[PDB]
Design a protein around this ligand. Structure first.
Ligand SMILES: [Cl-]
Ligand SMILES: [Cl-]
Ligand SMILES: [Cl-]
Ligand code: NA
Length: 257
């Protein structure tokens, strides 16, 4: 059952480190693509399977290298992951949405053949840090064919996204760039009631928490991607009956359980 299932039955411990797939990397040069600033593709190798794809945006003033750990982490668990650079480091969230959109098209149609050979372009998702997370929400509303969206410490001046795409938001309790009371939490609250949604808040974390190896970010991001991109219900257990000392808030409409 479940043609999209990949990898062994997950343990929490396994979700805090790189997963069972070898990872190859491909540099998309800034100049080779119109529509976004290039970036890095992390993707499985040594395997004949195909996997869902993820496009991921860094945050305000940041480089793709800021999320290299997470692009590798996700790919190692069985995903083709393009972390973009933006046209300008100063691009705001809706610009970043457009670039995510361009990056998804690139992955499906123009990436190298070794990358295309590993991708099932019918199963795509988005993620992003900060302002890139605001772009993640925007694109999830503009393009409901996406399977999942994971905004990390998100920032956006618009607070309401009417998307049917399953959303997991990571807030940081001590975030002073994108305070959870103005940003992360309104975003969660204002999503449709009928959309599967989860909000997790990291205790004692700032806005820069996504920029380095983080166990909670790893577990929840992998789990939400597996659950919806792969329909992999083996990951429901990390997202249901949650009791996690790493978190200082948790909210869900429990449609995913
Ligand atoms: Cl092969
Ligand atoms: Cl913008
Ligand atoms: Cl197409
Ligand atoms: Na500008």
């Amino acid at each position: 059952s479940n043609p999209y299932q990949r990898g062994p039955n997950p343990t929490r411990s396994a979700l805090t480190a790189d997963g069972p797939f070898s990872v190859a990397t491909y540099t998309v040069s800034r100049l080779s693509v119109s529509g976004f600033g290039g970036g890095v593709i992390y993707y499985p190798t040594g395997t004949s399977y195909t996997f869902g794809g993820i496009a991921m945006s860094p945050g305000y003033t940041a480089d793709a290298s800021s999320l290299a750990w997470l692009g590798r982490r996700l790919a190692s668990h069985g995903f083709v992951v393009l972390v973009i650079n933006t046209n300008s480091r100063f691009d705001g969230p809706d610009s970043r949405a457009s670039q995510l959109s361009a990056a998804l098209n690139y992955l499906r149609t123009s990436s190298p053949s070794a990358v295309r050979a590993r991708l099932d372009a019918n199963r795509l998702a988005v993620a992003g840090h900060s302002m890139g997370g605001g772009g993640t929400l925007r694109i999830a509303e503009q393009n409901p064919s996406l399977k999942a969206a994971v905004p990390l410490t998100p920032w956006h001046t618009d607070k309401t996204f009417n998307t049917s795409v399953p959303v997991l938001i990571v807030g940081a309790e001590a975030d002073t760039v994108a305070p959870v009371s103005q940003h992360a939490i309104p975003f969660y609250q204002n999503l449709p009631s009928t959309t599967p949604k989860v909000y997790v808040e990291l205790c004692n974390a700032s806005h820069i928490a996504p920029n380095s190896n983080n166990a909670a970010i790893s577990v929840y991001t992998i789990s939400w991607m597996k659950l919806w991109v792969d329909n992999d219900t083996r990951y429901r257990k990390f997202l249901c009956n949650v009791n996690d000392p790493a978190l200082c808030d948790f909210r869900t409409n429990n449609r995913h359980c």
